[PDB]
Amino acid sequence: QPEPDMITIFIGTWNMGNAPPPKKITSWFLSKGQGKTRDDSADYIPHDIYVIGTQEDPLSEKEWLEILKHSLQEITSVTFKTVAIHTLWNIRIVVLAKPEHENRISHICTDNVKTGIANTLGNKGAVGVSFMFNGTSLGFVNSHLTSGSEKKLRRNQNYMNILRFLALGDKKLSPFNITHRFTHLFWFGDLNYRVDLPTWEAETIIQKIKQQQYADLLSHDQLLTERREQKVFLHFEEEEITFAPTYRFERLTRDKYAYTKQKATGMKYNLPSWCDRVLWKSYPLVHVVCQSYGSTSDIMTSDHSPVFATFEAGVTSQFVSKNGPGTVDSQGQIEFLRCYATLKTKSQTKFYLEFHSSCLESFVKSQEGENEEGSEGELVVKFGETLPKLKPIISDPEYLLDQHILISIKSSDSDESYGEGCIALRLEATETQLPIYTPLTHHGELTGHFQGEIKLQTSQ
Numbered sequence: 001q002p003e004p005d006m007i008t009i010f011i012g013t014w015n016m017g018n019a020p021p022p023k024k025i026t027s028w029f030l031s032k033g034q035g036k037t038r039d040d041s042a043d044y045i046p047h048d049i050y051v052i053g054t055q056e057d058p059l060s061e062k063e064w065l066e067i068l069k070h071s072l073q074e075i076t077s078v079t080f081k082t083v084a085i086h087t088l089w090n091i092r093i094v095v096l097a098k099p100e101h102e103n104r105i106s107h108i109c110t111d112n113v114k115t116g117i118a119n120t121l122g123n124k125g126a127v128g129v130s131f132m133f134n135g136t137s138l139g140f141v142n143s144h145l146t147s148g149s150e151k152k153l154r155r156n157q158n159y160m161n162i163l164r165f166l167a168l169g170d171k172k173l174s175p176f177n178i179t180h181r182f183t184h185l186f187w188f189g190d191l192n193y194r195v196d197l198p199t200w201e202a203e204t205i206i207q208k209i210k211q212q213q214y215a216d217l218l219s220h221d222q223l224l225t226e227r228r229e230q231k232v233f234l235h236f237e238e239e240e241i242t243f244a245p246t247y248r249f250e251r252l253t254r255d256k257y258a259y260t261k262q263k264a265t266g267m268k269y270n271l272p273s274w275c276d277r278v279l280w281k282s283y284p285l286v287h288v289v290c291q292s293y294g295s296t297s298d299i300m301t302s303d304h305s306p307v308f309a310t311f312e313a314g315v316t317s318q319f320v321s322k323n324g325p326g327t328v329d330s331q332g333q334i335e336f337l338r339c340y341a342t343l344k345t346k347s348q349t350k351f352y353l354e355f356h357s358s359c360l361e362s363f364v365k366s367q368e369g370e371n372e373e374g375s376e377g378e379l380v381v382k383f384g385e386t387l388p389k390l391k392p393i394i395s396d397p398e399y400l401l402d403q404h405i406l407i408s409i410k411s412s413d414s415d416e417s418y419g420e421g422c423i424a425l426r427l428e429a430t431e432t433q434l435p436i437y438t439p440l441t442h443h444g445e446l447t448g449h450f451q452g453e454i455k456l457q458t459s460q
């Protein structure tokens with residue numbers, strides 16, 4: 001039975017509006033409704049992994065698990081195994097997988113983050129799950145961010161608190177937040193970004209939705225505009241939205257948007273918005289292709305419609321050689337030439353690099369770089385030809401070309417990371433000097449760049 005080099009992943013996000021679901025929710029898991037939908041010819045083909053994020057979920061874990069498993073069994077005649085379930089207040093994540101994957105999945109982690117302070121601490125935040133699938137690390141975040149059209153900055157702050165403090169993946173990756181710990185990271189939920197148009201335009205917006213003319217609405221979507229201004233979700237992808245706004249509906253129909261201010265809304269308008277979203281970030285040059293992104297039309301218990309997204313995702317096998325794991329493979333090496341970090345910092349400390357990768361026995365610390373002044377004010381940290389030669393555990397190119405090197409640039413004075421990034425070993429050539437590049441972030445914000453050349457030696 002061969003190990004897969006691709007899997008498909010279903011991501012669902014649904015704000016249930018504190019109401020039990022209807023008796024049938026299969027359209028959700030089938031990616032049927034509006035938007036980029038799944039072909040009918042695939043209906044019986046199970047996804048490998050289903051990740052379900054709910055918000056305002058009134059069910060017990062037991063009650064929801066029974067609905068989800070019975071739904072998937074009806075669709076596929078497969079009894080899915082529960083990988084993980086984690087709930088913070090009414091925010092929940094469930095991971096289910098085909099039984100054949102049970103001994104491919106390990107290192108399962110769960111965590112939550114509570115956002116806000118005092119007033120604003122008590123119902124918003126995120127839950128997450130991570131695990132290894134053979135040689136590939138997968139992370140999943142379900143977040144319910146701050147509501148209200150005039151709170152986009154709060155949502156952006158909630159995002160930064162979640163990526164800083166959610167403790168998933170390999171704890172040995174200590175300089176790295178969740179935006180660098182996984183081969184594939186999926187972040188979804190009721191992100192609560194709104195269509196920023198005047199209140200007086202509510203009926204105009206509704207008209208546009210009825211005509212399936214989303215362009216003038218998406219150009220005011222706060223998540224798209226904040227992402228384009230690099231205020232949030234830097235280096236994450238989202239599929240094009242081709243489904244109607246998923247909020248705020250009258251319950252028990254989808255024929256009506258309920259947008260007017262009411263005591264129940266705190267006297268706030270809820271103009272039709274794409275609150276419910278799926279985004280992802282994968283390591284460079286790993287296969288990830290969105291195969292559906294849309295909303296259901298037939299699940300009407302909530303004032304939100306469920307959202308689905310499906311992905312093909314590249315995976316790798318748990319590689320064993322005669323040599324590594326448990327030793328190095330002298331036929332392998334990674335060299336770095338003409339490397340320099342450009343940092344936005346106003347500080348003057350010495351810096352060194354750390355290289356982290358599961359292709360190394362442990363992380364590698366460089367010598368200090370040489371600081372110069374850039375022509376436009378910047379700090380340039382020159383490593384020249386001074387970086388160590390990295391010694392991978394396995395030299396086989398079928399393994400090594402699929403790996404990645406995480407880079408942290410740290411202050412010698414404080415040992416705090418000023419920037420993190422990632423370099424793919426999926427090179428055009430081996431034994432050849434080739435350009436490399438990564439942006440550097442810290443707390444998910446741009447802090448600089450790392451560039452230079454790489455020379456990769458494999459056993460071939």
Ligand SMILES: CC(=O)N1CCCC2(CCCCCC2)C1
Nearest residue numbers: 224225227228229235236237238
């Ligand atoms: C690959 C990627 O994610 N990019 C590059 C192209 C522009 C951006 C995507 C379009 C939506 C708004 C954010 C800007 C970001």
